[PDB]
Scaffold this motif. Structure first.
Motif, PDB file in Angstrom:
ATOM      1  N   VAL A 349       0.856  -1.188   0.000  1.00 62.14           N
ATOM      2  CA  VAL A 349       0.000   0.000   0.000  1.00 62.14           C
ATOM      3  C   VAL A 349       0.899   1.248   0.000  1.00 62.14           C
ATOM      4  O   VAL A 349       0.775   2.075  -0.902  1.00 62.14           O
ATOM      5  N   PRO A 368      -4.699  11.198  -4.595  1.00 64.77           N
ATOM      6  CA  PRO A 368      -5.954  10.649  -5.132  1.00 64.77           C
ATOM      7  C   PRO A 368      -6.596   9.558  -4.272  1.00 64.77           C
ATOM      8  O   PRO A 368      -6.008   9.125  -3.283  1.00 64.77           O
TER       9      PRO A 368
ATOM     10  N   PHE C 469     -11.722  -0.934   2.488  1.00 63.63           N
ATOM     11  CA  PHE C 469     -11.599  -0.006   1.357  1.00 63.63           C
ATOM     12  C   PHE C 469     -11.419   1.430   1.866  1.00 63.63           C
ATOM     13  O   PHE C 469     -11.852   1.745   2.980  1.00 63.63           O
ATOM     14  N   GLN C 473     -13.179   5.046  -2.134  1.00 64.07           N
ATOM     15  CA  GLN C 473     -13.222   3.738  -2.795  1.00 64.07           C
ATOM     16  C   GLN C 473     -14.604   3.118  -2.635  1.00 64.07           C
ATOM     17  O   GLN C 473     -15.207   2.714  -3.630  1.00 64.07           O
ATOM     18  N   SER C 498     -15.495  12.217  -0.586  1.00 67.88           N
ATOM     19  CA  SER C 498     -14.188  11.622  -0.286  1.00 67.88           C
ATOM     20  C   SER C 498     -13.400  11.235  -1.554  1.00 67.88           C
ATOM     21  O   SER C 498     -12.496  10.400  -1.488  1.00 67.88           O
TER      22      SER C 498
HETATM   23  N1  LIG Z   1      -8.502  -2.188   6.650  1.00 69.92           N
HETATM   24  C1  LIG Z   1      -8.027  -2.341   5.410  1.00 69.92           C
HETATM   25  N2  LIG Z   1      -7.862  -3.598   4.931  1.00 69.92           N
HETATM   26  C2  LIG Z   1      -7.386  -3.758   3.691  1.00 69.92           C
HETATM   27  N3  LIG Z   1      -7.017  -2.826   2.807  1.00 69.92           N
HETATM   28  C3  LIG Z   1      -7.194  -1.590   3.308  1.00 69.92           C
HETATM   29  C4  LIG Z   1      -7.683  -1.266   4.564  1.00 69.92           C
HETATM   30  N4  LIG Z   1      -7.743   0.109   4.727  1.00 69.92           N
HETATM   31  C5  LIG Z   1      -7.292   0.578   3.589  1.00 69.92           C
HETATM   32  N5  LIG Z   1      -6.941  -0.391   2.685  1.00 69.92           N
HETATM   33  C6  LIG Z   1      -6.420  -0.205   1.331  1.00 69.92           C
HETATM   34  O1  LIG Z   1      -5.293   0.645   1.386  1.00 69.92           O
HETATM   35  C7  LIG Z   1      -5.250   1.490   0.215  1.00 69.92           C
HETATM   36  C8  LIG Z   1      -5.106   2.934   0.630  1.00 69.92           C
HETATM   37  O2  LIG Z   1      -6.024   3.196   1.711  1.00 69.92           O
HETATM   38  P1  LIG Z   1      -6.366   4.662   2.263  1.00 69.92           P
HETATM   39  O3  LIG Z   1      -7.613   4.764   3.058  1.00 69.92           O
HETATM   40  O4  LIG Z   1      -5.201   5.131   3.126  1.00 69.92           O
HETATM   41  O5  LIG Z   1      -6.455   5.627   1.000  1.00 69.92           O
HETATM   42  P2  LIG Z   1      -6.718   7.192   0.914  1.00 69.92           P
HETATM   43  O6  LIG Z   1      -5.488   7.851   0.293  1.00 69.92           O
HETATM   44  O7  LIG Z   1      -6.965   7.738   2.268  1.00 69.92           O
HETATM   45  O8  LIG Z   1      -7.981   7.449  -0.022  1.00 69.92           O
HETATM   46  P3  LIG Z   1      -9.384   8.132   0.287  1.00 69.92           P
HETATM   47  O9  LIG Z   1      -9.134   9.644   0.275  1.00 69.92           O
HETATM   48  O10 LIG Z   1     -10.299   7.774  -0.881  1.00 69.92           O
HETATM   49  O11 LIG Z   1      -9.888   7.653   1.596  1.00 69.92           O
HETATM   50  C9  LIG Z   1      -6.473   1.136  -0.632  1.00 69.92           C
HETATM   51  O12 LIG Z   1      -6.124   0.321  -1.746  1.00 69.92           O
HETATM   52  C10 LIG Z   1      -7.409   0.439   0.362  1.00 69.92           C
HETATM   53  O13 LIG Z   1      -8.206  -0.575  -0.240  1.00 69.92           O
END
Ligand SMILES: Nc1ncnc2c1ncn2[C@@H]1O[C@H](COP(=O)(O)OP(=O)(O)OP(=O)(O)O)[C@@H](O)[C@H]1O
Ligand SMILES: Nc1ncnc2c1ncn2[C@@H]1O[C@H](COP(=O)(O)OP(=O)(O)OP(=O)(O)O)[C@@H](O)[C@H]1O
Ligand SMILES: [Mg+2]
Ligand SMILES: [Mg+2]
Lengths: 570, 124, 568
Positions: A349, A368, C469, C473, C498
């Motif tokens: 990740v 993003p 997710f 997402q 979001s």
């Molecule tokens: N508890 C979890 N278990 C498995 N995968 C996870 C978990 N939490 C997040 N992910 C995965 O980690 C990746 C990044 O997560 P994250 O929430 O940090 O993204 P983000 O940059 O904050 O995006 P957004 O602004 O849309 O929330 C994604 O591919 C997501 O599916």
């Protein structure tokens, strides 16, 4: 047997009281055999010789026996009821306390309904190993020991015949009990599945109704409900199949001792009357033997459920370092050094995330959807631990700082706002319980929360619904922002804090927020780039990697991926 | 080598009386059981009277009760059965049974059993 | 009375189970007589032919007793488990029909108990009855018949001991019943504490109130065990007190029997047999008390189960509700006035506007205007106090709910996904959806790129609420879910809150290209995304502030300008 030894271990702080229970039940057992003996004696002493002048004395003796027997039964139950509930209380306490130590990763993957079931339905099932189950076992072992001594007192030869039928009773108990535990463990795990469906469906009923999934969720339920009906019947049948089966075994024993008894009478050893007497003495031995064997089949319900209770109690919980330090005089020196992270531990990740934040700075974390912005924050909160890399708070590694101190220095307004079913005051008081009514009212006024709070029927004392759904999505975020500011942390995280908060209110708070944000290190995650453009540092993320870093004006003239993000807003 | 001789069976009218003798000859050590059974021309084996020498208790059939009486002479080594107020319903072939216990018998192995001869007793 | 109907389709097993118990009972009562015949008639007379004759007979009556015993256990297990299984599915069907205002009355935690624990208590009562419904009265009537046969005059004291017995199992009813209700009410509280902790563990850990929650649970766990000991103390006192009066009956028989023998009205041999059948009457009397101990526990659960089944949902379909197989998308509000509670001020008041079919209407306004509430009126999630909501010039109340909700797809403000697969979660809209159809909807939602990147693809595991997710997402998955349903009316509550600005553009311009003809309502906090719409609806402080083009609103609508200035 391994689970039985562990479950029986909960009776150890009650050893002395359980000895008293055994002392009282043995007296109740000797009185229980003295009562029909005295009725038999009264007929032969006052009725047969027709001298009723003695009758009031024998009646008084028999009356005192019944008064003592009933008082002992009450005493047995009264102390056992409290003793049993103290064990059940300890098991419920042990489960909840354990979950508070167990990592966050478990709650996301395992259904909540199954955990709720294990706390109430499974702990309620270890009651058929406590209470009257202990009283019946205690009474059963004394009657059995008291009968076997009376058998050898009558005839030793015939006693060996009645004892040689016992291994057959033990064998059929072993077959039935193993099957009872097999189907009961399955019954309790299918129950947790069904409890998981009812729990999830109620908390999302609006979505089920909106997509007309009421029928498709009913057929989803009916699959698990039919499976519960199928294994539940099997467990119930095996639970009570032993008593009529043992009556069949007793009859084979009765026929064998009739043959053996008749043989001894023909050998001049005993008489015909001795056979008729031994069948009476064998009945007082078979009764507790079948009772104890049936009790062994019944305790399989508690044993199968005990496994499900202990399963939660042996989970690898979150533990602090043996030489962990407490953060004193917090300033806010946050740093990431070549940090790599993956949730599934297969596909990464975050990839080589490295950045430095000096104390006081208001840093922005933009990128993003699915970049890994929340992941950076979740690692700083230590909800998850880094695969390869180092996180340094105040110049000390995150693994060396105790969780208690780390989470006290760092505050978070989570992406998904979670509220509680209490008063508005208590929801805001969470995090900092030592906050005055004036401090709460001043903090709410600053984030423009105070307006709608006053409009409620009880004001700050207005009891909120589950997760605070009796407010607008934006209004719930304003309460989350107030709760975090009231907690007064040296490091504050505003991860998508104004997702549902309108631009008009967002502009109004930002001005008053800066005064309550200065002198504090902060990480602000936002997709509304126009608010985070005033930040001291902007960390631009993409595909789990830091692509760009620096100030707004520097990144705009660079015409990079930040420029593409900012321009896309219009 | 123990043999049982049966004698004393003849035609007796209803309400009458008849005694039956069962002489035993051989190497008798100690008799533990003595029994009498009647057999109809189309029946297996019944039970009329019994005697257990350890207590002296007599166990009779439900129809007999206070009619037939079983006894044994110690010195003469002969079993007896006195029949009183005979009803024509008990017209059958009467038999004898005797169980003997010898000196030093094994822990699980039993001793011997000896049957009679059979004499017809007709009551009309 | 209503709960008895749940056993009616399984009446065959419901009548066989107590009948098979009689078969066992007659065999167990034959045991002392058959074991007496093998020794006193078989062994005693010496005839080996009678030993085996009675020997084969006793082993056969034991086999008939065993078949009767196992038969009773099997038939009772069928009818009781099936009673519960049918009641559980009929309760969950009622829970699925409920609105959130119905779920707010019987707290979420309490409903879990009502569908599991309260059913189990009723199921166990049916199980208990099935075995001893005819065993207990026949042994009691048969017992007193044997007591009267020996002596009628001595059987007169057996009537004298009934008043304290009846006064005792009535005391256990009046005091007992509300106390077992308090146990079931205390289980709702321990359910509530464990539920709120599971659903919000991150808040507990972040604010370090872990010790506070352990005390919050200890207060509920102590209140639960205190409710249990208080209701079961009522039995640990009554049962030995009953047993005492029962054993006092023997003294009453021996005393009066003594007077009878003294006056030569009863035989000395008759008292020996009377003592045995008197204990049988008393043992059978205990079984009548035991059913009452199960009835008082089940009565508290029966009230809790029935009130859920008798609860009428807030939103109900009319008897003359017209079926809507085809819709155009003519959403209209006719002087709509709404209130969440009678005491509070109107949430929406004086709302009168009409929407053209296929047109895109951008909904705007400050936090707490009533945008989410106004949208919820369209798929009939809520009904107004005064005025009416119309779809295709037809009052939404007078239309079939499954038909109406089928044509209206929504993306909620707080996106909630369900446990299973991505493919299953997207098929939530249309179950008859093609693999190409779900891929097309995910391609418009820009989530397709992520789903294919996963190792399991569309069959990848989704956790409870979609916690595995990211923020945007699961939001993009909710857009793809609503698109699959192919609606005529689409509702988008802060569709891309979001989601990043680049992905936001791809979704918005993507929707305008494929949702042509569908009447789309888009709640937005952004003016650039709002300019895409044919008409702009602006709400302020509950009432409708404006409706029309961008130019019309900049010159007449004061709150629209305030929202415009905050961005430009
Ligand atoms: N508890 C979890 N278990 C498995 N995968 C996870 C978990 N939490 C997040 N992910 C995965 O980690 C990746 C990044 O997560 P994250 O929430 O940090 O993204 P983000 O940059 O904050 O995006 P957004 O602004 O849309 O929330 C994604 O591919 C997501 O599916
Ligand atoms: N379930 C509910 N019970 C009681 N009051 C509610 C409920 N939902 C909303 N409200 C109240 O109704 C008003 C408007 O509701 P609504 O959720 O539609 O606001 P909104 O315009 O969508 O705001 P936002 O953009 O922040 O979500 C607010 O004052 C809010 O507190
Ligand atoms: Mg996020
Ligand atoms: Mg809203």
């Amino acid at each position: 047997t391994a689970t039985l030894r562990r479950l029986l271990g909960y009776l150890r702080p009650h050893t002395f009281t359980l000895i008293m229970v055994f002392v009282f039940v043995t007296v109740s057992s000797i009185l229980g055999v003295l009562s029909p003996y005295l009725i038999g004696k009264t007929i032969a002493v006052v009725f047969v010789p027709r001298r009723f002048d003695l009758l009031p004395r024998y009646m008084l003796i028999l009356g005192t026996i019944y008064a003592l027997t009933s008082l002992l039964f009450w005493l047995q139950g009264k102390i056992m009821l409290t003793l049993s509930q103290d064990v059940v209380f300890r098991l419920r306490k042990e489960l909840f306390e354990k979950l508070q130590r167990v990592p966050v990763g478990f709650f996301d993957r395992t259904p909540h309904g199954d955990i709720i079931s294990r706390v109430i339905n499974d702990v309620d099932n270890i009651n058929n190993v406590l209470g009257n189950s202990i009283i019946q076992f205690f009474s059963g072992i004394v009657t059995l020991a008291g009968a076997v001594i009376m058998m050898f007192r009558v005839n030793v030869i015939l006693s060996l015949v009645t004892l040689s039928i016992v291994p057959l009773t033990v064998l059929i108990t072993q077959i039935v009990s193993s099957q009872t535990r097999k189907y009961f463990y399955e019954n309790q795990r299918v129950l947790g599945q069904l409890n998981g469906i009812i729990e999830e469906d109620i908390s999302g009923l609006t979505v089920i109704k909106l997509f007309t999934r009421e029928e498709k969720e009913m057929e989803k339920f009916d699959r698990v409900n039919e499976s519960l009906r199928k294994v539940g019947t099997k467990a119930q049948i095996f639970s009570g199949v032993l008593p009529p089966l043992m009556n069949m075994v007793n009859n084979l024993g009765f026929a064998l001792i009739s043959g053996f008894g008749g043989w001894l009478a023909l050998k001049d050893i005993i008489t015909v009357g001795t056979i008729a007497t031994f069948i009476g003495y064998s009945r007082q031995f078979t009764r507790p033997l079948n009772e104890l064997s049936n009790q062994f089949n019944m305790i399989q319900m508690a044993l199968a459920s005990a496994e499900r209770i202990f399963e939660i109690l042996d989970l690898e919980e979150e533990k602090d370092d043996p030489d962990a330090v407490e953060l004193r005089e917090v300033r806010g020196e946050i740093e990431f050094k070549n940090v790599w992270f993956s949730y599934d531990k297969k596909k990464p990740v975050l990839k080589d995330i490295t950045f430095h934040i000096k104390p006081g700075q208001k840093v922005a974390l933009v990128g993003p959807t699915g970049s890994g912005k929340t992941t950076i924050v979740n690692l700083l909160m230590r909800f998850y631990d880094v695969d390869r890399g180092q996180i340094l708070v105040d110049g000390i590694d995150i693994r060396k700082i105790k969780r208690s101190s780390l989470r006290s220095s760092i505050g978070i307004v989570l992406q998904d706002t979670i509220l509680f079913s209490t008063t508005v005051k208590e929801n805001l008081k969470y995090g900092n319980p030592g906050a005055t009514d004036e401090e709460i009212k001043e903090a709410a006024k600053l984030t423009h929360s105070d307006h709608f709070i006053k409009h409620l029927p009880e004001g700050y004392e207005t009891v909120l619904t589950d997760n605070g759904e009796d407010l607008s999505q934006g209004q719930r975020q304003l309460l989350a922002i107030t709760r975090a500011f009231l907690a007064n942390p040296k490091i504050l995280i505003l991860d998508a804090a104004t997702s549902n908060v309108d631009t008009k209110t967002e502009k109004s708070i930002q001005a008053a927020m800066w005064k309550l944000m200065e002198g504090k290190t902060s990480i602000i995650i936002a997709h509304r780039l126009n608010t985070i453009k005033n930040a001291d540092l902007i960390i631009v993320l993409r595909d789990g990697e830091i692509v760009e870093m620096g100030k707004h004006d520097e990144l705009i003239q660079k015409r990079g991926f930040y420029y593409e993000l900012f321009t896309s807003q219009y | 080598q123990v043999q049982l001789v049966e004698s004393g069976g003849g035609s007796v009218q209803a309400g009458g009386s008849l005694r039956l003798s069962c002489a035993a000859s051989g190497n008798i050590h100690h008799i533990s059981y003595l029994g009498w059974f009647r057999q109809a021309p189309g029946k297996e084996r019944e039970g009329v009277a019994a005697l257990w020498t350890k207590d002296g208790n007599t166990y009779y059939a439900d129809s007999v009760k206070g009619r037939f009486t079983v006894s044994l002479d110690n010195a003469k080594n002969t079993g007896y059965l006195q029949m009183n107020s005979l009803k024509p319903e008990d017209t059958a072939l009467y038999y004898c049974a005797a169980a003997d216990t010898g000196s030093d018998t094994p822990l699980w192995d039993w001793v011997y059993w000896y049957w009679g001869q059979g004499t017809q007793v007709t009551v009309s | 009375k209503t709960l008895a109907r749940y056993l009616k389709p399984y009446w065959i097993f419901a009548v066989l189970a107590p009948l098979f118990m009689v078969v066992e009972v007659i065999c167990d009562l034959s045991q002392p007589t058959l074991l007496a015949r093998i020794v006193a008639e078989g062994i005693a007379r010496g005839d080996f032919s009678l030993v085996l004759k009675t020997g084969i007979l006793m082993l056969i009556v034991a086999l008939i007793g065993a078949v009767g015993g196992i038969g009773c256990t099997v038939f009772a297990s069928y009818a009781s488990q099936n009673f519960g299984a049918d009641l559980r599915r009929d309760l969950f069907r009622k829970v699925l029909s409920f609105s959130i205002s119905n779920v707010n009355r019987f707290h979420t935690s309490s409903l879990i108990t009502r569908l599991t624990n309260d059913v189990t208590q009723l199921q166990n009562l049916v199980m208990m009855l099935l075995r001893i419904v005819v065993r207990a009265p026949l042994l009691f009537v048969g017992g007193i018949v044997m007591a009267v046969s020996i002596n009628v005059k001595l059987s007169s004291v057996l009537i004298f001991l009934i008043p304290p017995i009846v006064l005792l199992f009535v005391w256990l009813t009046k005091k007992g019943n509300p106390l077992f209700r308090k146990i079931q009410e205390s289980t709702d509280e321990v359910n509530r504490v464990v539920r709120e902790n599971l659903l919000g563990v991150r808040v507990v850990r972040a604010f370090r109130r872990e010790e506070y929650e352990n005390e919050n649970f200890r207060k509920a766990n102590e209140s639960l065990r205190r409710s249990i000991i208080s209701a079961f103390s009522l039995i640990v006192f009554a049962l030995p007190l009953f047993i005492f009066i029962v054993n006092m009956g023997m003294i009453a028989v021996l005393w009066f029997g003594g007077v009878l023998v003294r006056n030569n009205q009863m035989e000395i041999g008759s008292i020996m047999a009377y003592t045995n059948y008197l204990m049988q009457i008393m043992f059978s009397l205990m079984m009548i008390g035991n059913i009452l101990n199960f009835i008082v526990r089940a009565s508290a659960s029966a009230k809790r189960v029935l009130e859920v089944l008798n609860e009428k949902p807030a939103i109900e379909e009319a008897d003359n509700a017209l079926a809507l197989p085809n819709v155009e998308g003519s959403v209209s509000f006719e002087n709509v006035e709404f209130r969440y509670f009678e005491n509070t001020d109107p949430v929406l008041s004086g709302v009168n506007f009409s929407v053209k079919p296929g047109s895109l209407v951008a909904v705007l306004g400050e936090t707490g205007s009533g945008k989410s509430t106004l949208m919820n009126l369209i798929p009939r999630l809520i009904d107004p106090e005064r005025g009416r909501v119309e779809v295709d010039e037809l009052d939404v109340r007078t239309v079939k709910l499954k038909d109406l909700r089928g044509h209206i797809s929504a993306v909620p403000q707080e996106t909630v996904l369900f446990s299973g697969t991505i493919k299953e979660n997207l098929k939530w809209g249309r179950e008859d959806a093609t693999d190409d159809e779900i891929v097309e909807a995910a391609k418009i939602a820009q989530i397709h790129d992520f789903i294919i990147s996963l190792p399991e693809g569309y069959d990848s595991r989704v956790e409870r609420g979609g916690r595995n997710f990211s923020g945007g997402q699961k939001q993009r998955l909710s857009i793809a879910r609503a698109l699959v349903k192919k609606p005529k009316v689409l509702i988008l509550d802060d569709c891309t809150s979001s989601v990043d600005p680049i992905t936001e553009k791809r979704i918005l311009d993507g929707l305008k290209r494929y949702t042509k003809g569908c009447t789309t309502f888009i709640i937005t906090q952004k003016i650039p995304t709002a300019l895409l719409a044919d008409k702009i609806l602006v709400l302020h402080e509950g009432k409708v502030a404006g409706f029309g083009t961008h130019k019309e609103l900049l010159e007449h609508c004061k709150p629209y300008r305030e929202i415009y200035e905050s961005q430009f």
